[PDB]
């Protein structure tokens, strides 16, 4: 076992919870995988594929993000922070995408989920791009239950950091698609106690994080240093109470000690 899988094993012991950790060093395509195998519940990281899946029908239906959607109450779910202000209106799939990524609204994952035709929609991107681990299986808010041992809705580290990598810096989504995706992970607004907390100030991230039941706290970020190539981080951490709190500063850690490990 390596020294940052000691470091990283020493922060999962302190935490009490199952900590996953997956890097990709696009410098040479080494990895370095903590749990990398196991399953984790996504909550709103999945927010990502969906997002993604969107962009990759944006590439033939060109207009696509501009499609105004309805935001009716019925549609209001359990955190709705940008699709409550629009509700008896409507948002633009580019706005719902936005408001999914940078801020974790629910109600806009929903529409994603529906825009691809229901949860399979999203994970038959992941298929399409090569991600055979993904699995999203409900909508919000009940893909969050994060449950021990159910595999509903869940990735690996490992899975997950590929995925990520092939969106971002790889080529899986078109060139404008791209860049909007990697715009819109920069800019989100929820990251700043996980993995962005754990990093020399100097390195730009973007990041999607997620949060539900277990105490699960998660967060998967492109990370670009400065002249050195960029670095795909993906932590997962849950834990063994349901009413668990969130733990983010773990992520942070991990994120820390990954960095140290270069």
Sequence with gaps: TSAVQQKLAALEKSSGGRLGVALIDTADNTQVLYRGDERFPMCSTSKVMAAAAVLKQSETQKQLLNQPVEIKPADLVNYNPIAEKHVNGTMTLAELSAAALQYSDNTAMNKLIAQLGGPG??????????????????????????????????????????????????????????????????????????????????????????????????????????????????????????????????????????????
């Design 121 to 262: 929609g999203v994970t038959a991107f992941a298929r399409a791009i090569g991600d055979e681990t993904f699995r999203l299986d409900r909508t919000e808010p009940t893909l969050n239950t994060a449950i021990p041992g159910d595999p509903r809705d869940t990735t690996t580290p490992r899975a997950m950091a590929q995925t990520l990598r092939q969106l971002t810096l790889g080529h899986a989504l078109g060139e404008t698609q791209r860049a909007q995706l990697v715009t819109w992970l920069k800019g989100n607004a929820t990251g700043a106690a996980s993995i962005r907390a754990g990093l020399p100030t100097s390195w730009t991230v973007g990041d999607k994080t997620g949060s539900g039941d277990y105490g699960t706290t998660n967060d998967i970020a492109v990370i670009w240093p400065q002249g050195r190539a960029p670095l795909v981080l993906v932590t997962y951490f849950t834990q063994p109470q349901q009413n668990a709190e969130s733990r983010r500063d773990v992520l942070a850690s991990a994120a820390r000690i990954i960095a140290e490990g270069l």
